[PDB]
From a paper:
During the first 3 years of the pandemic, the spike (S) protein on the virus surface has been actively undergoing antigenic drift generating a large number of variants. Being a highly dynamic protein, SARS-CoV-2 S-protein has been observed to adopt RBD “up” and “down” conformations. Our structural study reveals that interactions between the VL6-57-encoded mAbs and RBD are mainly mediated by germline gene encoded residues in HCDR3 and LCDR1, while germline gene encoded LCDR3 residues support HCDR3 in antigen binding. We provide evidence to suggest that the identified class of antibodies constitute a potential immune pressure driving the genesis of S371L/F-S373P-S375F mutations in Omicron variants.
BLI assays confirmed that all of the 5 recombinant mAbs are able to bind to wildtype SARS-CoV-2 RBD with affinities (KD) in the range of 30-1504 nM. Notably, H18 exhibits detectable cross-reactivities with RBDs of SARS-CoV-1, Bat CoV RaTG13, and Pangolin CoV GD1, with affinities ranging between 134–332 nM. H18 has mild neutralization activity towards wildtype, Alpha, Beta and Delta SARS-CoV-2 authentic viruses, it also possesses activity to trigger conformational change of SARS-CoV-2 S and exhibits inhibition activity in the S-protein-ACE2 interaction mediated cell-cell membrane fusion assay. Unfortunately, we were not able to uncover high-resolution information on the H18 epitope from these structures.
Numbering used by the authors:
A (entry chain C): 14 to 70, 76 to 617, 641 to 676, 689 to 699
B (entry chain D): 1 to 110, 118 to 220
C (entry chain E): 1 to 224
D (entry chain B): 454 to 502
């Protein structure tokens, strides 16, 4: 069981800086006097790390449910053994396999079960009156468990339950990792005499117990123990004491680390590759000593941030309208079938007519069907009365849809109809259009029925006469220009789409987009996807070409189809990076040089040199750079760049 | 002449499912798209559903619309009622180049208990009499239900001319408030001995009187 | 994203010309052929469609409002305006300029609704009168006092007590039509009867359209 | 299971009972249109071939 806390004044969390902390053995092998690099999860050096306080003098008690990333770093400058253990899980509601690594004064229990975790589990220590010793009595960390398979008990560990307010004497660090379901624990106790601002000393971490559970964790939370002395009333609402403690929580990131080993086999120092340019030079050379000279570490690539595509100047349309504006149309038993291929189609003009009575278009959103394209577009045109326009829908039953043109469930078509009584009907009786009323059975969708056979009703054949039990299925209309609104001739066109493996021939392309120049961007001009700048060229193309090559046979010239301007193509990433090092036992700062990248910072002939000031005086040089310019460490004293004196 | 017929008031308890209709008179509902709008009182309307079967990004998935073209009534099925759903519902159509909206549905649940109608009165001020005007103010406050009837009384006789009153309005303490004003000439104020305002609420009557002093 | 803001006066006299302009910021009127429309809504009634326009000269109007709606679009200022002729007292509605793409579809973005009320007579200052408490104006251990805001036009009036120091027990009542055009309301506060002759209560009635601020002291009635 | 949204990595178990969406219209997990329940029962029979 658990109880709830009351609202009180807390302290906001602080942020401190790590100093060569979070280094552990990445493997269980022995290495002597070697400098090898591994790609695992480590804490970055000089990184921003969180800080949580636990002192009483006020009433600081923070237990946030921090998310468990790919590896965490838990360091504590423990003095009076305040913190007891840690919990892990995803939702903490007895639904997933949670964890409980809790350390009591007698034995260490690691129970991976589905505990009922409350809002703020904690350990309660009560001070006895007759006995002058602190003992743990309030065991409120969970309610009960449901089912589990793993339960491990580690070696016993003695503990002191008395809390004080003095300075810390020991430092404990913990690293928890989860690779492919396997739990990892690394820890080592290191004595120290300090309160905050952790020392710059180096100490590796060795694993103690390896835990093969086989699950994934996304959240974690730490546990603290408070004391119930005679000063406090003894209620866990507003009066309590927690001694003095401070635990640091840091997240591990995947970086390459260069590990140093002595002849005894222990780790003495670690060098990162993505923290400092000087540290990058140390780990690429696989040595801790760097001499004066030039060095190449990696390359500089200018990644584009935007992509622009424009195939046409504007969207266009091909000759059409005969399926809409015509002298006459067909009936429903034999309707006109039209196929659209190798035609660019615009549906905006088909909507801004403001003359259609009805429009139903399912499957695709009508406002966003222009950008998406399909392979083939089928146009089916037929006439119908005003009261049968409601029947044309997927999932309807009647006398016209089930016998002439069935609508299937997966109908992504587009139905357009309008009133054309002034042309499709005439005085005296317009009976030029026919329809089918009688049929033996149902028909498949997208099927045309042109059979004129007389539908037999009874069991007596008639041999094609007009007698008994034999009715002719095709019947005339009742169109008249003097009718109302429910029986007018409506011209229905169905615009269906096909889904099959073929390039989109009929499509409205990406039209006009925002044009950007003089920046390294990505473009797709109908034949290539190249990342580069677009400068204004001075060479005119013949009026029948699109692309342009060079002596080296590279597409470095393209014509924009918007208004026919010629734009050059030039890559934005040139060469790599370089670092200038004065050498060992001389300096610590370094200068970063770019090979062929155009831009304290000095624009040299051989690219950009940063971190080194330029001096007009000329001396003899020792570290070459290129193009008659060197770098050296002179007079405090910094790295200077100058023309080499002959 | 195509209109959308919509029920005026629809009331169900929270947690259940409801159905709101939108009936077209002449044109069929399947002819044109129907758009439903959920508008807070005193705020801009917001589209709650469109294209008759699919939902905008941002609204909960509980708002479902259905179309049965046989009865020509656009249906909006809403399930799991909450406090924030208490608003107006309007359905839209297009007819032919003329957008036609719906009547409007008041989604209501069906909490303030009965409260005593405290009534106070004031005589006209002296500076108002110096402006050749006179007005008696009758005030009804901290009452529930908000169904009060006001009736001025010139001594025994009643008053109807110059009588204006305000509809009950919700207070901060969940009760209702009301007012009543009687425009009057200064000579008629001193003509009778005393004027009284009587407030009737749930059968009980609370009466106060004022006199020219 | 994009947003629409309406402007123009909130008042109009009968048989006059309405001028409401809706401005667009964060987008282009001509781009995308984005249609434009206006919708009004009377208080307590359903939405009413007025008309719709394109960035070209295409337009359409409600036949109930036909031959009375004049809407024009100017691209240089990136806004569209509507002109209404022969306005009557039944045209009191909350006007929304309606951002909408599909002519048969939806109004995806709605601008804030400007309140339009048909202006009668002319804008005139309020007449503030005190409500003097007395022995017959109290019922028990608490008393009531206030100020009367009568014969003012147009809406609204903001009444504050002791420059906003007193908020508890303060009730603001909605305005009602008088017998002839004008409006009247009151604002009162409930105070204990012990603080009648020892505490000074002042009401601050502000009428922004008429540019009149009146401070009136409330005192117990003096019998004469 | 007969249908899935996309490819799955090897040595992975999927126990998702969510109704697959084939189009762009949600169904609120009903037996409606343009959607279907992905898990299907077998057709085992002792008198099979
Ligand atoms: C850590 O971040 C905080 C704010 O997020 C900032 O104030 C502080 O300077 C940072 N510390 C370091 C070492 O970057
Ligand atoms: C606390 O210590 C007692 C010693 O008797 C032990 O039995 C118990 O398991 C411990 N609790 C935990 C959570 O380790
Ligand atoms: C037993 O525990 C397993 C997890 O190890 C769980 O999947 C299973 O549902 C549990 N059985 C019962 C009956 O709770
Ligand atoms: C992570 O845990 C969740 C919850 O048990 C599970 O559904 C998911 O499959 C797990 N992912 C992996 C990669 O194991
Ligand atoms: C570490 O190496 C030194 C030799 O430099 C040796 O004297 C010392 O005993 C070694 N440490 C241990 C723990 O053996
Ligand atoms: C593309 O359209 C634009 C604008 O209509 C025009 O200026 C341009 O000349 C066109 N380009 C062609 C037709 O190649
Ligand atoms: C075709 O017919 C429609 C409808 O009657 C009409 O609006 C349009 O102007 C006609 N011509 C063309 C070229 O679309
Ligand atoms: C480098 O870029 C800057 C600004 O983009 C420009 O002024 C300068 O001329 C460029 N350098 C060269 C060598 O083109
Ligand atoms: C070096 O001296 C020359 C002499 O004219 C001057 O132009 C130049 O700016 C000087 N360089 C620096 C870095 O001061």
């Amino acid at each position: 069981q658990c109880v709830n806390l009351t609202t009180r004044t807390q302290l906001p969390p602080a942020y401190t800086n790590s100093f060569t902390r979070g280094v552990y053995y990445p493997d269980k092998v022995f290495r002597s006097s070697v400098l090898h690099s591994t790609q695992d999860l480590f804490l970055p050096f000089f990184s921003n790390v969180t800080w949580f306080h636990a002192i009483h003098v006020t009433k600081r008690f923070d237990n946030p449910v921090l998310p468990f990333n790919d590896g965490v770093y838990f360091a504590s400058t423990e003095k009076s053994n305040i913190i007891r253990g840690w919990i892990f899980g995803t939702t903490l509601d007895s639904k997933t396999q949670s964890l409980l690594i809790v350390n009591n004064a007698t034995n260490v229990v690691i129970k991976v079960c589905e505990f009922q975790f409350c809002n703020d589990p904690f350990l309660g220590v009560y001070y006895h009156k007759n006995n002058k010793s602190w003992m743990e009595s309030e065991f409120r960390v969970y309610s009960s468990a449901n089912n589990c398979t793993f339960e491990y008990v580690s070696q016993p560990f003695l503990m002191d339950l008395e809390g004080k307010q003095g300075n810390f004497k020991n430092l404990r660090e913990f690293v928890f990792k989860n690779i492919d379901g396997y739990f990892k624990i690394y820890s080592k106790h290191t004595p120290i005499n300090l309160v905050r601002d952790l020392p710059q000393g180096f100490s590796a971490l060795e694993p103690l117990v390896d835990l093969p559970i086989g699950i994934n964790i996304t959240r974690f939370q730490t546990l603290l123990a408070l004391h119930r002395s005679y000063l406090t009333p003894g209620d866990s609402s507003s009066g309590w004491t927690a001694g003095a403690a401070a635990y640091y929580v840091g997240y591990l990131q995947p970086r390459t680390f260069l590990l140093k080993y002595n002849e005894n086999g222990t780790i003495t120092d670690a060098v990162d590759c993505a923290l400092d340019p000087l540290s990058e030079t140390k780990c690429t050379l696989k040595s801790f000593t760097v001499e004066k000279g030039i060095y190449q570490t990696s390359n500089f690539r200018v990644q584009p941030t935007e992509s622009i595509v424009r195939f046409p100047n504007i969207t266009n349309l091909c000759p059409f309208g005969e399926v809409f504006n015509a002298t006459r149309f067909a009936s429903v038993y034999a309707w006109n079938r039209k196929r659209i291929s190798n035609c660019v189609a615009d549906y905006s003009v088909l909507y801004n007519s403001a003359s259609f009575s009805t429009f139903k278009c399912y499957g695709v959103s009508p406002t966003k069907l222009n950008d998406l394209c399909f392979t083939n577009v089928y146009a089916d045109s037929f006439v119908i009365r005003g009261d049968e326009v409601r029947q044309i829908a997927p999932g309807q039953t009647g006398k016209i849809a089930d016998y002439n043109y069935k609508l299937p469930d997966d109908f992504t078509g587009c139905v357009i109809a309008w009133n054309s009584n002034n042309l499709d009907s005439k005085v005296g009786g317009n009976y030029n259009y026919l329809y089918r009323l009688f049929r033996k059975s149902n028909l498949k969708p997208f099927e045309r029925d042109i059979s004129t056979e007389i539908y037999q009703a009874g069991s007596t054949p008639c041999n094609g006469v007009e007698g008994f039990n034999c009715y002719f299925p095709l019947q005339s209309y009742g169109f008249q220009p003097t009718n109302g609104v429910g029986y007018q001739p409506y011209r229905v066109v169905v615009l269906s789409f096909e889904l099959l493996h073929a390039p989109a021939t009929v499509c409205g392309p990406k039209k006009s987009t925002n044009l950007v120049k003089n920046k390294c961007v990505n473009f797709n001009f109908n034949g290539l996807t190249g990342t580069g700048v677009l400068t204004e060229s001075n060479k005119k193309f013949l009026p029948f070409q699109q692309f342009g090559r060079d002596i080296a046979d590279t597409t470095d010239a393209v014509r924009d189809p918007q208004t026919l301007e010629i734009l050059d193509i030039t890559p934005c990433s040139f060469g790599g990076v370089s670092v200038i090092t004065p050498g060992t036992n001389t300096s610590n700062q370094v200068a970063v040089l770019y090979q062929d990248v155009n831009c304290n910072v000095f624009q040299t002939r051989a690219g950009c040199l940063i971190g080194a000031e330029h001096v007009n005086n000329s001396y003899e040089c020792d570290i070459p750079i290129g193009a008659g310019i060197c770098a050296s460490y002179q007079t405090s004293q910094s790295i200077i760049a100058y023309t080499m004196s002959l | 002449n195509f209109m959308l017929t919509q029920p005026h008031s629809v009331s169900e308890s929270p947690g259940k499912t409801v159905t709101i209709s939108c009936t077209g008179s002449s044109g069929s509902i399947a002819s044109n798209y129907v758009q439903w709008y959920q508008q807070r009182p005193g705020s801009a309307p917001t589209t709650v559903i469109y294209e008759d079967n699919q939902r905008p990004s941002g609204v909960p998935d509980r708002f479902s619309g259905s179309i049965d073209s046989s009865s020509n009534s656009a249906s909006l099925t809403i399930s799991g009622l909450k406090t924030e759903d208490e608003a107006d519902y309007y359905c839209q159509s297009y007819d032919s180049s003329n957008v036609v909206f719906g009547g409007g549905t008041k989604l209501t649940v069906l909490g303030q208990p009965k409260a005593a109608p405290s009534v106070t009165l004031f005589p006209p001020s002296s500076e108002e009499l110096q402006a050749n005007k006179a007005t008696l103010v009758c005030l009804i406050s901290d009452f529930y239900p908000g169904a009060v009837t006001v009736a001025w009384k010139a001594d025994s006789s009643p008053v109807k001319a110059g009588v204006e009153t305000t509809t009950p309005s919700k207070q901060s303490n969940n009760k209702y408030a009301a007012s009543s004003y009687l425009s009057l000439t200064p000579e008629q104020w001193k003509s009778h001995r005393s004027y009284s305002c009587q407030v009737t609420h749930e059968g009980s009557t609370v009466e106060k009187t004022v006199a020219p002093t | 994203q994009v947003q629409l803001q309406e402007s123009g006066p909130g008042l109009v006299k009968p048989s006059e010309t309405l001028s409401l302009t809706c401005t667009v910021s964060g987008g282009s009127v001509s781009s995308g052929g984005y249609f434009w429309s206006w919708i009004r809504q009377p208080p307590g009634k359903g939405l009413e469609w007025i008309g719709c326009i394109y960035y070209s000269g295409s337009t359409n109007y409600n036949p109930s409002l036909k031959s009375r709606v004049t809407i024009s679009v100017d691209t240089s200022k990136d806004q569209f305006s509507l002109k209404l002729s022969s306005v009557t007292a039944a045209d009191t509605a909350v006007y929304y300029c309606a951002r909408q793409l599909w002519l048969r579809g939806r109004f995806d973005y709605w601008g804030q609704g400007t309140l339009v009320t048909v202006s009668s007579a002319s804008t005139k200052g309020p007449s503030v009168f005190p409500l003097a408490p007395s022995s017959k104006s109290t019922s028990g251990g608490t008393a009531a006092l206030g100020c009367l805001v009568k014969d003012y036009f147009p809406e609204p009036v903001t009444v504050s007590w002791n420059s906003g120091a007193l908020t508890s027990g303060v009730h603001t009542f909605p305005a009602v039509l008088q017998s002839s055009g004008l409006y009247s309301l009151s604002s009162v506060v409930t105070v204990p009867s012990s603080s009648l002759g020892t505490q000074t209560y002042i009401c601050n009635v502000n009428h922004k359209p008429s540019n009149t601020k009146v401070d009136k002291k409330v005192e117990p009635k003096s019998c004469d």
